[PDB]
């Protein structure tokens, strides 16, 4: 179902609506594109523009609040646009960070219309969209050099999300009505280089599963069982993948690992009966 | 962060950037302070107001370069003697090793080699250029004798800029106050080229005070100018040492001082000179990317943290050693410039995500980006 040459500039992200019927591509050309996919067809609708620097990542909001797609660019700003009347418009612009923003994912509709922003400005922001338009932002420093990922943890307070460091550190953050904002929990060390990406699973089974990919060219699957329980570092393999590692994605169900390399190859992984990993 | 005044730092080589701020030898207090310290710093510690571990020294520094993390810090001191330090594990405690002075009362620059991290370099006043083997150097300070290359022009012009080849531990470059930048082959044991610009278009022999090579190509050196007017960077491709393959023009006003040509990226050149300005250029074409404000006027050193390229520091006789970020975009939160950026700040290559960046989605379909970076791909794999 290829959509050959969607952009002019190299593409940095390919995400779909909750109903895999409409896509969203973003590139360096500072532009994002909306799509329609059927059997093998690709209808190109609008092309989102207002981004000064290369767009990095984008994320589809839950249909619960209509059609909304958020994008983050080098321009140190993340922007969201809705699709009222089949015509794409820019609803709000979030630019609190001072430097590139490399990741932006939406919170489980349960939580609400929340967006988690992680900038290379070393900080991270949490923003929910009220009514009138003016939101109440929440920012908290998260890493030394910077921040590269900010995946969320499923619903359960009890609001958690993992961060990937520019300083090689993976962290866990849980809300706190007494602290007024998300505070640190874990600080799982493991990578020798920078944490390129970290995604948290929705697999509600007995134990929690977290993925961490990095310039150190390895994935460390962080498995923990309960509050007490510490996270068990686990090398996806006791060798190095020839190139870096940029993305890690969790399948809806069946909990399978989508590990987008850098050697330009995508690999899939599963945890056999023991607790190790194998292809698919 | 930001800290104590006057000093010429040197960056480490760990992803947890550490600084070594030895005191410089140019300025003097308003009350003539005296003892240089050689303090150490981390970007984490409480309000970075306290050094990790200092180490009082006799005289003041003229330079400091960290061997390629081999926990060896070379210092060029007031009194023509270089001294190597140790530090037993970053963050722990700075300790001093041997000290030499095979020089003629004057040690100016100190450069450590990339390939063959066991080689060092120093530039004196008699045009003295030495090469020590850090392995058989700690051996006996007896008077261990370093090596000399030998060629063309000297007098009392002190080599005040050392830079190695980033693709052949074999070669390096000398620059001082003369109109000649020297290219050195160590297997040929002797200078092999005389870089020298004079085409100002205003016909004035320009001086080459700084040299920094290209981070990958074995035939490209940066040659900064000294003249307090029409300072330039000039990219030379020794494939032809008669004309600059590129010229970064009209940027600085008064002379230039320091050049750090990024490693992770070859399209990012930092630049500090005799003015209260720090520039970041794109040496491919020559577009001036952004202009960071300076301590006030006159910055000798300015480097990208060797392993944290979005991080750079600016030494300045002005006041203190300032560390900055390659970025600092106008917030929204909080509203003495912040960092005006010309022809953008072209995202650094260590941001180029050719990666297929896949995603699972509705119905077990696996999205992605093809081996052409321009074409998407949707599929449903066999979970088996």
From Swiss-Prot, chain A:
Determine if Kinase is one of this entry's keywords.
no
Pfam families referenced in this protein's UniProt entry, alphabetically? WD40 (PF00400)
Q: Subcellular location, in the record's words?
A: Cytoplasmic vesicle, COPII-coated vesicle membrane; Endoplasmic reticulum membrane; Nucleus, Nuclear pore complex; Vacuole membrane
| Superkingdom, taxonomy of origin | Eukaryota
| Keyword match Cytoplasm | no
Name the UniProt key words of this record, in alphabetical order: Cytoplasmic vesicle, Endoplasmic reticulum, ER-Golgi transport, Membrane, mRNA transport, Nuclear pore complex, Nucleus, Protein transport, Repeat, Translocation, Transport, Vacuole, WD repeat
Q: Which GO terms describe its molecular function?
A: structural molecule activity
Q: Where are the WD repeats?
A: 6-45, 50-91, 96-137, 142-183, 190-232, 240-279
Question: Quick one: a GO biological-process term for this protein?
Answer: protein exit from endoplasmic reticulum
Function, as annotated, reads: Functions as a component of the nuclear pore complex (NPC) and the COPII coat. It is one of 5 proteins constituting the COPII coat, which is involved in anterograde (ER to Golgi) double-membrane transport vesicle formation. First the small GTPase SAR1, activated by and binding to the integral ER membrane protein SEC12, exchanges GDP for GTP and recruits the heterodimer SEC23/24, which in turn recruits the heterotetramer SEC13-SEC31. The polymerization of COPII coat complexes then causes physically the deformation (budding) of the membrane, leading to the creation of a transport vesicle.
Q: What else is known?
A: Present with 21400 molecules/cell in log phase SD medium.
List the protein's name.
Protein transport protein SEC13
- Species source reads Saccharomyces cerevisiae (strain ATCC 204508 / S288c) (Baker's yeast)
Swiss-Prot record, chain B:
Gene Ontology CC terms: COPII vesicle coat; endoplasmic reticulum; endoplasmic reticulum exit site; endoplasmic reticulum membrane; mating projection tip
Query: Is Signal among this UniProt entry's keywords?
Result: no
Query: Can the keyword Endoplasmic reticulum be found in this entry's annotation?
Result: yes
What is a single molecular function from GO for this protein? structural molecule activity
* Mapped WD repeat ranges: 2-42, 56-95, 102-142, 154-194, 203-246, 251-291, 294-334, 359-379
Alphabetically list the UniProt keywords.
Cytoplasmic vesicle, Endoplasmic reticulum, ER-Golgi transport, Membrane, Phosphoprotein, Protein transport, Repeat, Transport, WD repeat
> Which superkingdom is the protein from?
Eukaryota
Location of the protein in the cell: Cytoplasmic vesicle, COPII-coated vesicle membrane; Endoplasmic reticulum membrane
GO BP annotation list:
COPII-coated vesicle budding; COPII-coated vesicle cargo loading; endoplasmic reticulum organization; positive regulation of ER to Golgi vesicle-mediated transport; positive regulation of protein exit from endoplasmic reticulum; protein transport
| Coiled-coil zones | none
More details: Present with 1840 molecules/cell in log phase SD medium.
State what this protein does. Answer: Component of the coat protein complex II (COPII) which promotes the formation of transport vesicles from the endoplasmic reticulum (ER). The coat has two main functions, the physical deformation of the endoplasmic reticulum membrane into vesicles and the selection of cargo molecules.
Similarity comment: Belongs to the WD repeat SEC31 family.
Task: Note the subunit structure.
Answer: The COPII coat is composed of at least 5 proteins: the SEC23/24 complex, the SEC13/31 complex, and the protein SAR1. SEC13 and SEC31 make a 2:2 tetramer that forms the edge element of the COPII outer coat. The tetramer self-assembles in multiple copies to form the complete polyhedral cage. Interacts (via WD 8) with SEC13. Interacts with EMP24, ERV25, SEC16 and SHR3.
**Annotated protein name in UniProt:** Protein transport protein SEC31
- In the complete protein, the residues contained here run 5 to 410 of 1273
